[PDB]
């Protein structure tokens, strides 16, 4: 019940580059390498949920100004057309999927807090016993560009060949990052949004609060967690009209000691990195 | 009569990644981009011609020593088995293709010679008029590891969008490399090999010379020059068992001001780099 | 039987200044609360993180009183 049983690296590559689609996660499966004796959408959206609009044309109205200026008795109501100039305020049909916030951790240590927050600072659920939320709802690992950060319990952490059982270092174990799902899904370390906490009045300011976790609301669309060559299990050809070439999984051509996904001098088959399948694209 | 007339970059990617196979090159072709108004083996061998042997098994004899040691009257004939220990002397059934040497040029200008050798140092053939040899026979552009060297006339050089007609800088043009074919073909800037130029004797030392040009011999094999998206014109699927994943052609992951193989703000379509056809591998 | 997945066991080596570290261990029979699971239930429901931690800020959590 792990893809690397049934697929070679070459076949897995062959699969993921050309196609748009096709149990406690214990050890004990058939080993990935045949000589060893032992004892679903696959694409990345090319559009983001909030940019679906036509940038060239106006829309509906939004409330631009609640006062005329600085002074007393300036209350007013003004309005403006939602348009290309301001895209944040336009009305939209669909909204991003559910969220349950994970505490954010940085791989470089000097950034992290000097305290033991492994268990205390983690997302858990209760059933009189408390259990960690892992991996949880499918959410983007980090905001765009910030690879050094990972959700504490929101990602599937594999391990390098020969890794120890306990207290291994960060370089020792692989941490998958769901960068592709950010388009439709909120970042696992960010709040979902804000709500109003009160009713404004002449004496009361508008007050808001953060949404840490948000269930399903009508209109939520989302993507699910990608599958990895090392990942548990339980063809649609690519139809795209895109002009410019795709991002495709590939092996870099540079001199190195060992061939990746091959035996070393001692005969130990090694998998260098996790490989998920989202490479080709689709319009949202 | 240029591939980019009939293929899009996305289509050209589908072709070269998935398939082992499928009039003076003047300007004036249909444009690469459809909205503009105008007025074969594709694989790289995974083995070299000289490594085809079985590394574990001895072969046949060669002459190891012509002397016993230092001194007078030390002549002897010793023979050894050509084997894994010494792989240069083993016998082979085939040899690399023909060569007609080009002068070598360095893209780092300070290590080129300070003299004018554009024309005077060029490979040519006369027909009482001397025409430059361009590109000439198919030969590897440069030795392994040297990417900064290119043969003088031995390559195809495309201009970047907007590149002027006359005396443009090195960056403004796109210099292709044949590096894939270094397996079966001699390097363009290197001599083909050596031949004995005399008969040795007690009074004559063995003399050799360099072969600067070579015609077809029985037993040669060679690859033709690869074709490019930008190049002149006038399917076969991969069956391979290769275990480790392939090299593929993928668009760069990083954010940029403008997308490759698309139009900019002024509406000018451009082709960033020359794209060859040879990515997948075969056995020699 | 162990899972092949890992979890974050320790964020500090000991008591004292600058002890930040990242350690990982195998989730297995010994500690069953940290194993990754495919399905979740649908007293408070659990806890979520309320803030980003940093060198200055400790990790904070809060109770989920209702959940969809």
């Amino acid at each position, epitope marked *: 019940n792990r893809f690397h049983c049934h697929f070679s690296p070459r076949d897995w590559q062959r699969l993921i580059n050309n196609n748009w689609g096709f149990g406690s996660a214990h050890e004990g499966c058939l080993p990935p390498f045949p000589a060893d004796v032992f004892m679903h959408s696959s694409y990345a959206h090319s559009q983001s949920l909030d940019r679906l609009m036509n940038p060239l044309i106006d829309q509906l109205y939004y409330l631009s100004k609640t006062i005329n200026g600085s002074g007393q008795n300036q209350q007013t109501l003004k309005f403006s057309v939602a348009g290309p100039s301001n895209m944040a305020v336009q009305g939209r049909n669909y909204i991003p999927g559910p969220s349950y916030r994970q505490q954010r951790v940085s791989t470089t*240590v*000097t950034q992290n807090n000097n305290s033991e927050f492994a268990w205390p600072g983690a997302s858990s659920w209760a059933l009189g016993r408390n259990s960690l939320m892992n991996p949880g709802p499918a959410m983007a690992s980090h905001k765009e560009g910030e*690879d*050094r950060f*990972f959700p504490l319990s929101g990602s599937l952490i594999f391990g390098k060949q020969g890794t120890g059982r306990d207290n291994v270092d960060a370089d020792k174990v692989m*941490i998958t*990052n769901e960068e592709e799902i950010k388009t439709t899904n909120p970042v696992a370390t960010e709040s979902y949004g804000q709500v109003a906490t009160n009713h404004q009045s002449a004496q009361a300011q508008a007050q808001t609060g953060w949404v840490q976790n948000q269930g399903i609301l009508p209109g939520m669309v989302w993507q699910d967690r990608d599958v990895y060559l090392q990942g548990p299990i339980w063809l649609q050809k690519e139809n795209s009209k895109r002009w410019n070439p795709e991002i495709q999984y590939t092996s*870099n051509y540079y001199k190195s000691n060992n061939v990746e996904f091959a035996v070393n001098t001692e005969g130990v088959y090694s998998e260098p990195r996790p490989i998920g399948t989202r490479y080709l694209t689709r319009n949202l | 009569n240029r591939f980019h007339c009939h293929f899009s970059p996305r289509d050209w990617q589908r072709l070269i990644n998935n398939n082992w196979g499928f009039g003076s090159a003047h300007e004036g072709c249909l444009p690469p981009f459809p909205a503009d108004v105008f007025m074969h083996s594709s694989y790289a061998h995974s083995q070299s011609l000289d490594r085809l042997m079985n590394p574990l098994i001895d072969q046949l004899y060669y002459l190891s020593k012509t002397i016993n040691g230092s001194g007078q009257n030390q002549q002897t004939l010793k023979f050894s088995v050509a084997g894994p220990s010494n792989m240069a002397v083993q016998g082979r059934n085939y040899i690399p293709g023909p060569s007609y040497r080009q002068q070598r040029v360095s893209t780092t200008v300070t290590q080129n010679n300070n003299s004018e050798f554009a024309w005077p140092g060029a490979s040519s053939w006369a027909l009482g008029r001397n025409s430059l040899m361009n590109p000439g026979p198919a030969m590897a552009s440069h030795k392994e590891g040297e990417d900064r060297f290119f043969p003088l006339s031995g390559s195809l050089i495309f201009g970047k969008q907007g590149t002027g007609r006359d005396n443009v800088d090195a960056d403004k043009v796109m210099i292709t490399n044949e590096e894939e074919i270094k397996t079966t073909n001699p390097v363009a800037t290197e001599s083909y090999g050596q031949v004995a130029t005399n008969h040795q004797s007690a009074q004559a030392q063995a003399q050799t010379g360099w072969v600067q040009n070579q015609g077809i011999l029985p037993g040669m094999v060679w690859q033709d020059r690869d074709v490019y998206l930008q190049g002149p014109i006038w399917l076969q699927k991969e069956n391979s068992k290769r275990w480790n994943p392939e090299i593929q052609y993928t668009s*760069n992951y990083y954010k940029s001001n403008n997308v490759e193989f698309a139009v900019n703000t002024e509406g000018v379509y451009s082709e960033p780099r020359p794209i060859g056809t040879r990515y997948l591998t075969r056995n020699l | 039987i162990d899972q092949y997945l890992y979890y974050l066991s320790k964020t500090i080596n000991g008591s004292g200044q600058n002890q930040q570290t990242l350690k990982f261990s195998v989730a297995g029979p010994s500690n069953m609360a940290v194993q990754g699971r495919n399905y979740i239930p649908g007293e408070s429901y659990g806890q979520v993180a309320t803030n980003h931690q940093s060198a200055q800020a400790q990790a904070q959590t809060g109770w989920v009183q209702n959940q969809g």
Partner: antibody
Amino acid sequence: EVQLLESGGGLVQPGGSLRLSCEASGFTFSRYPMNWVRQAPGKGLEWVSHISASGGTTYYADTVKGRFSISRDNSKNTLYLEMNSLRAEDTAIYFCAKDYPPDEVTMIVVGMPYFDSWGLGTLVSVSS
Amino acid sequence: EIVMTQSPATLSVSPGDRATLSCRASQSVSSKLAWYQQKPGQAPRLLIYAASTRATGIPARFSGSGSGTEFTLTISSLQSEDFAVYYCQQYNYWPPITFGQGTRL
């Protein structure tokens, strides 16, 4: 070859500004992390800043923190360091260092900052 | 930060002789350390990284070992080409990456 070439001014007035540019060739610029190492005359090398291959995350020395800004351009294949409000203490020989190993796209990047290849260095000296 | 301390200031030895110099650091640097050399008017050159792992273009004579707070670099069969300043660096706790004062030779 992994040749690293950088160009910068040799003099400025204190409180002034300058822009260093390191241009790379011979390797995939996007794949590896980069950073600047500064060496004072007759002194050991001291690390200044760091920037990831993506360019999303950047780190700085406490001495320099907030005063200098590091920048990458993967397309133009160049590395930048924009320093301003310099002081006499800043006079030194700056180097361009290529981080070894490369950043990987699939895993959450973990960085070991040991530099495989360096630059020939430029000299910035600020005095009046 | 972590303060790297490289003990011998200048180690003057004869060629063809095994040289062992060291650098100690505060707290623990685990196994993440690297050795450099800087010849006069020349960029540094990476010698050893991790603990014992020797870089590709390095002669087979250079070797090193150590862990934790203490580390040893062993040069065997010194030659005229090997005379220069040396440096150690730990990438364990950063920023800010720290470089040792150096050992002339």
